[PDB]
Design a binder for this molecule. Structure first.
Ligand SMILES: *[C@@H]1O[C@H](CO)[C@@H](O[C@@H]2O[C@H](CO)[C@@H](O)[C@H](O)[C@H]2NC(C)=O)[C@H](O)[C@H]1NC(C)=O
Ligand SMILES: *[C@@H]1O[C@H](CO)[C@@H](O[C@@H]2O[C@H](CO)[C@@H](O)[C@H](O)[C@H]2NC(C)=O)[C@H](O)[C@H]1NC(C)=O
Ligand code: NA
Ligand code: NA
Ligand code: NA
Ligand code: NA
Lengths: 274, 274
């Protein structure tokens, strides 16, 4: 099919770009995958460097690639605007790309997923907390927990070094409260979360794996210290999968740095296309 | 602050009409109320005969008034098309009105509600079952359970006398199966259901109230025989409210026939605007 830029998709004061890949083999009622790029990247760049456009020709979903407006290409995952439901930041623009696409293509709103890598993984967690209503499931490749990049001076697209270096450590309860405040009083459904992180990540250090799993455990009321199951060498040698429940699993990749390589077929399974 | 007809809102093979009321006091991130008319009526008729446009000026949400394409003005709540997620029937059309409005007005997709009287209350149950993903909550004014108007010959807009007379009686399990089958395999968010009916209804017999409460009890995993709470004279004298749980309450109006009059302020409370 083709990658098209869309410029009028709804309110977008932070000027995020929107690109979509509409497959040739478009399903009758297509799903949506939102695939969110890393720093120094762009939406078309992530299109070029991820399996989603290929998989969309198999499964017939539309892929949305949001594109950062900021110098350096990171996502704003620090401002109040981006860290609040309807706050008007980058995350709100991404939400609007979703709803534009659902209406324009008759996409199935119950089959909308979000995934990303590095900065886009940070944004994935933020999308899950700020627009939980939009997403059935999410897959995070090497990010930080929602609100870990909080700026204590309301900076937009600010890098939080304390968080990245793994110095921010707290309880499931505290992280859950932080995620909950991104949509205060929301009690509806939330996407099922899958969190990947590598053990030799020297950009977003591995403590962030545990902080993120703590967060979603706290959000879904799972006992962080008592997972349901742990699967060795799953999905492959030196990856370990911890399942806390239907709405949370973490995959820790020993010997892997920034970022954990996208596992496209595994994504299709978690989302439910496969 | 006007009622507008909308003509190109997405796939609409059964040619349902779409009318919307956009209030003057429109909220920044408006909710949506879908208000579904009775037999012999139309969307604009229900606009003229319900409190929702008046209330939209208080609470700032948009109202969508679908309009039956059929002679006699009843809704198709009988065909396989209308009784299946993405089946292409009237229900599918109403779904598309929702998604069009979300995108066009930047409406909040977590704040979308559906309600209706008589034929429109039947369609309300159908919408909850066929497009559960769209709706946070629903209020049913004197309808029949989803799939009670099933046509054994796949008739479109067929009246089922056995159902209307109150002669279709089955279990929570069986009604829940009927509802589940309208979107098979779905296990996400569904609207919180509020069901009104009058004890002396001789159009849609009051057995249908109990069949509907059974249906939603089965769907949500509630014990139909053990509701959480009963409230005398609630919301008013001779009405009684039974709460089965967060996602189901029934309101039986003793001495009221077809239909139970709309309690607009109570709808606001159930929906969460108030
Ligand atoms: C960087 O990120 C952390 C969170 O990862 C921020 O820490 C929060 O800071 C406030 C005080 O400003 C505390 O009340 C919270 O309890 C902290 N949260 C947690 C989970 O610890 C921190 O403020 C950020 N730093 C900068 C410089 O913006
Ligand atoms: C009228 O409606 C009822 C459902 O309310 C239909 O009943 C179903 O009929 C099929 C056989 O066609 C049975 O297998 C189901 O068990 C019945 N369901 C229930 C809940 O009883 C009935 O067929 C409809 N009548 C007509 C003439 O279409
Ligand atoms: Na469709
Ligand atoms: Na791609
Ligand atoms: Na939704
Ligand atoms: Na908005």
């Amino acid at each position: 099919g083709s990658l098209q830029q869309v410029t009028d998709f709804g309110d977008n004061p932070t000027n995020v770009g929107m690109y979509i890949y509409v497959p040739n083999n478009l399903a009758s009622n297509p799903g949506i995958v939102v695939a969110i790029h890393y720093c120094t990247g762009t939406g078309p760049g992530y299109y070029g460097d991820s399996p989603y456009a290929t998989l969309s020709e198999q499964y017939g979903f539309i892929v949305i690639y949001p594109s950062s407006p900021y110098s350096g290409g990171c996502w704003d995952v620090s401002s109040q605007a981006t860290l609040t439901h309807n706050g008007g930041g980058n995350s709100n623009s991404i939400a609007n790309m979703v709803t534009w696409t659902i209406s324009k293509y008759g996409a199935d709103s119950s089959k909308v997923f979000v995934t990303g890598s590095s900065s886009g993984a940070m944004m994935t967690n933020v999308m899950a907390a700020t627009y939980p209503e939009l997403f059935a499931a999410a897959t995070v490749y090497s990010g930080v927990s929602a609100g870990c990049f909080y700026s204590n001076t309301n900076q937009v697209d600010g890098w939080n070094s304390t968080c990245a270096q793994g110095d921010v450590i707290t309880t499931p309860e505290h992280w859950a409260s932080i995620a909950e405040a991104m949509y205060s009083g929301y009690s509806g459904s939330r996407p099922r979360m899958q969190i990947y992180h590598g053990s030799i990540d020297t950009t977003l250090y591995p403590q962030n794996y545990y902080e993120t799993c703590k967060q979603w455990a706290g959000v879904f009321g799972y006992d962080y210290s008592a997972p349901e199951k742990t699967e060795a060498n799953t999905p492959q040698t030196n990856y370990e999968t911890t399942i806390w429940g239907d709405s949370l699993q973490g995959i820790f990749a020993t010997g892997v740095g920034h970022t954990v390589p996208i596992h496209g077929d595994k994504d299709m399974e978690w989302f439910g296309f496969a």
